[PDB]
Structure 1
Amino acid sequence: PPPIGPKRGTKVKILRRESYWYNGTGSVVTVDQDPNTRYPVVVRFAKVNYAGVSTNNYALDEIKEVV
C-alpha cells in the first residue's frame, strides 16, 4: 500500500477559511495512515495564534503543496 499524503518536511499552504494561518505556509510533521482519521495531516507554524498554539491538524483537501 502506498503511503498517503506529503512526506515529512514538505512546505504546505493552508486553505481552511476559519484558520488563523489561512493563506500562509507551514511544515508537515507527520501523516496518520488510519483510513478512519478525518484530519490526518499535522502541520507546524512559526507564529502562534491568538490562543498561543503553533500546530494544527488538517485534511488532505485543505492543504496545497508549494514547491
Structure 2
Amino acid sequence: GPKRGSIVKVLRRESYWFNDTGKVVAVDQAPGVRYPVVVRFDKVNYAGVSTNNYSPDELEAA
C-alpha cells in the first residue's frame, strides 16, 4: 500500500479518526491480509487506543 511514515487521512465511516490524519507504521505485505496498513494517531479514542489497521483502499489523502 502506501509508504512508511506517510501521512494519510482516514475514510472509514465508522472510525473514531474519520477525516483525521495519521502516519503509517508498517504495512504488512502478506498475500491474504484484508487490512494490512497500520497507522498510529496522536489522539486516543473513547477506548484509549491510538493504533489501528486499515485496508489500502480505505484511507488515502496524502
TM-score normalised by length of structure 2: 0.95
Distance 2:48 2:34 in 1: 24
Which segments of structure 1 move beyond 3 Å, counting only runs of 4 or more? none
Q: 2:8 aligns with which of 3, 12, 18?
A: 12
Does residue 54 (structure 1) correspond to residue 50 (structure 2)? The answer is yes
TM-score norm. by structure 1 comes to 0.89
Task: Tell me the C-alpha RMSD between the 2 structures.
Answer: 0.7
- Asked if residue 37 in structure 1 is aligned to residue 33 in structure 2, the reply is yes
- Are the aligned partners of 2:35 and 2:55 in contact in 1 as well (CA < 8 Å)? yes
More strand by share: 1
Is 1:28 aligned to 2:27, yes or no? no
Kept in 2: contact 1:10–1:65 (CA 8 A): no
Q: Structure 1 regions of 5+ residues with no counterpart?
A: none
Q: Which ranges in structure 2 are unaligned for 5 or more consecutive residues?
A: none
The alignment-based identity, stated in percent, is: 73
Looking at CA atoms only, which structure, 1 or 2, has the larger radius of gyration? 1
